[PDB]
Every structure is written in structure tokens, then in C-alpha cells.
Design a protein around this nucleic acid. Structure first.
Ligand SMILES: [Cl-]
Ligand SMILES: [Cl-]
Length: 335
DNA sequence: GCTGAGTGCCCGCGTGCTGGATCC
DNA sequence: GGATCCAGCACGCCACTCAGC
């Protein structure tokens, strides 16, 4: 009956050693072999627009040249593209830091604003920094503001009653994330994409994202972009109806998902954040050094050792997700 | 659409314990 | 040794969604 619920519980209660992860698709070592199962659907290669993004535009936002990306889809899931980590070595750190220290501060609205004010809310980063100096990090203490951060809205905010977006309490969308999103969208064949509504989600090792569909009336020709940084996770992509058996796949640090049309209508969930392997506190793609020569225009710049130390201690047991949508038609504003 | 069961949307709240950590 | 603390859990409740009619 309720196949998605049962598999969601299965992968949630997965403790590496308890449950079998053999059916979870790893796009980093993609099969491409013709039907090497059921029940897993076939993985197909997705041709990219290699010439649509200049290597300099890709480097300014930390991405490899589009000629080097490998993208895949799944048979039966039109509109779903999975791009394993296309970032240049060391470039995920800048976007992680943007999520942790920059995008978390005002005017952006977070969960922390529900029962607090901009008092220490603006001092989230300084609080974590002070925690790291005092070595009070193993010491017993109340959870920091950074550790209590769960989500952040960017750009237009969604109305759960209207099922529509509006300009009420609009906060400006970050232009650098918009540029990165536009590069990814153009590379996937979506011309004229404008990042306008964003969600940042911060997950602990026991965090989950339940089964849900997106029901808002939007232009389904436009892509939705989903970036993941930090610890790996398992992602479940289901069907139009909640009781269809989903397909499981890994989300490694730097992986990007692009969803359009049909696949935007499907049930999906994130049942589990996997703990890091032994002796691999962080993914290899997060410790690599930045390229020596950076473009003078580059939006990715090396950050403080203090800032990255905060980021690394946080990401040791966390996953960060960025979700980006276009909600307004090309040209038209919000009247 | 209605209604009881099921989880906690970019939905949680308040309160009383408690037992491991902390302090000297 | 021993007094003290308090972060987090359990719990009951509210918020909101889902499923079966
Ligand atoms: Cl959507
Ligand atoms: Cl489609």
C-alpha cells in the first residue's frame, strides 16, 4: 500500500551497518548500463549545453567548465537532472560560508526570528566564533544560535493560504547566489532564469525532510535548483501519488539537482543525513585548496581561517541545502 | 469537501523532571 | 565526596497535512 512511507522509515532508521543501502543510486559512480535491475530505474546521460556558459563565468562562481560536468536523469522521471559535484576544488567553502554567516543575518528571515529579536540574532557568527576561542565547544552549554538555525527565506515569501507568492515582506535576493543559479540553469538548457525565491535548510544528523509535493501554481517550464553541502544524505524521489515506491539516491557535497516539469510534481523526501565515515570528518571536496589564480571578477574568494574553522566544526555533523525558484514571469513584476 | 489519523510545511509551544556534567 | 546545575527529553497540546469516504 503506502510504499513511500515504508521506504522512508526504512532509510530513516538506517544505521550504516543496520540496513542495506545497495538500492541507493550513486551518481558519482553512475551505472549507465541498460536496466541492471528492477526495481531501480535506468540511469541515462543528460546532454548539457557546453558552449552556453563561458569557463570564466563558471569560474567566477566556483564551477568547473560545463564541458567537464556529467549530468544524469532517470527513465520515467522527465524533468529531473542530477549533476554530481561540479565545483572547482575548494569552491564549496565560499558558498557554505555564505549560507552560515551571511545569508543567516538580517534582513533575511529565519526561524530564529520566531521568538527572538535582532539582538544576538545579528551576533550569531560572533557567538560561534567566541565559542571556538574559549574551547567551550566540548564543554556543556546551551545550543548556539548557529546550532539552532533551521531555515532561511530569501526573496519572495510563500503564502501557504493563497498557495501563491507575494511581495508582502520581500527581502532582496542575494545577487551572487542568483548568478550561480543562473549559470547552472543556462548550463542545463534553461535560458533566462532569474533566481527570485530561495530556501536555505540546515539539517542535523537526526534531521529529516518528510514526504511532500509542491502544490503552488508556478511556471513549470522554469527549473528549481537544489544545492547540497556538507554531510551526505539519502534523497527519495517518488511519484504523482504518495503510495508509489520511490527511488533512492545519494546527495554528496556539491551535488546539484535541477527539477522541471513532470518531476516538479512528484513526492520527494530526505529521510536521513548520513554520519561521516571514520577518519573522514569532512568530505574530500571541502578541504581541497582554491585555485592559485582567481579571476579579478570572481565572486568566490578565500575567507578567514576563523570563519572556515567555524564552518568546518559545524559541518562535521550537518548538511546545508539551497533551493532556488523563479516565481515571476520574465519582465512582469509583482502588482 | 468532511473528518479522524498522522506528523510536525520555508508549522511547532510550555512546563516539570533529571541525571550526567560541572564546581570546589 | 558531595552539593549544584541545567540541556534535553517526555508530555500534552496546537498547527497543519493526509487519507478514506
Ligand atoms: Cl515547485
Ligand atoms: Cl516534463
Amino acid at each position: 500500500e503506502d510504499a513511500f512511507r515504508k521506504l522512508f522509515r526504512f532509510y530513516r532508521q538506517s544505521r550504516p551497518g543496520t540496513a542495506d543501502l545497495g538500492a541507493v543510486i550513486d551518481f558519482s559512480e553512475a551505472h549507465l548500463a541498460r536496466s541492471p535491475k528492477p526495481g531501480v530505474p535506468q540511469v541515462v546521460r543528460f546532454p548539457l549545453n557546453v558552449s552556453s556558459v563561458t569557463e570564466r563565468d563558471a569560474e567566477r562562481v566556483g564551477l568547473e567548465p560545463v564541458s567537464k560536468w556529467r549530468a544524469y536523469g532517470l527513465e520515467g522521471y522527465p524533468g529531473f537532472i542530477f549533476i554530481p559535484n561540479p565545483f572547482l576544488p575548494g569552491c564549496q567553502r565560499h558558498w557554505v560560508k555564505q549560507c552560515l554567516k551571511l545569508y543567516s543575518q538580517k534582513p533575511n528571515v529565519s526561524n530564529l526570528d520566531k521568538h527572538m529579536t535582532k539582538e544576538e540574532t545579528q551576533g550569531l557568527w560572533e557567538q560561534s566564533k567566541e565559542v571556538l576561542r574559549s574551547k567551550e565547544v566540548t564543554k556543556r552549554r546551551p545550543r548556539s544560535l548557529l546550532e539552532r538555525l533551521r531555515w532561511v527565506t530569501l526573496g519572495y515569501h510563500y503564502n501557504w493560504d493563497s498557495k501563491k507568492y507575494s511581495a508582502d515582506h520581500y527581502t532582496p535576493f542575494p545577487s551572487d547566489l542568483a548568478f550561480l543559479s543562473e549559470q547552472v540553469a543556462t548550463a542545463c538548457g534553461f535560458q533566462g532564469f532569474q533566481a527570485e525565491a530561495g530556501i536555505l535548510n540546515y539539517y542535523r544528523l537526526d534531521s529529516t525532510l518528510g514526504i511532500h509535493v509542491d502544490r503552488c501554481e508556478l511556471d513549470h517550464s522554469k527549473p528549481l535548483l537544489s544545492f547540497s553541502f556538507g554531510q551526505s544524505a539519502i534523497f527519495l524521489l517518488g511519484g504523482l501519488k504518495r503510495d508509489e515506491a520511490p527511488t533512492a539516491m545519494f546527495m554528496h557535497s556539491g551535488d546539484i539537482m535541477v527539477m522541471s516539469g513532470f518531476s516538479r510534481l512528484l513526492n520527494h523526501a530526505v529521510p536521513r543525513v548520513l554520519p561521516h565515515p571514520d577518519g573522514e570528518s569532512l568530505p574530500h571536496s571541502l578541504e581541497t585548496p582554491l585555485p592559485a589564480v582567481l579571476p579579478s571578477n570572481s565572486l568566490v574568494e578565500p575567507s578567514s581561517v576563523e570563519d572556515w574553522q567555524v564552518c568546518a566544526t559545524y559541518l562535521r555533523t550537518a548538511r546545508v541545502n539551497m533551493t532556488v525558484r523563479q516565481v515571476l514571469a520574465t519582465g512582469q513584476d509583482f502588482p
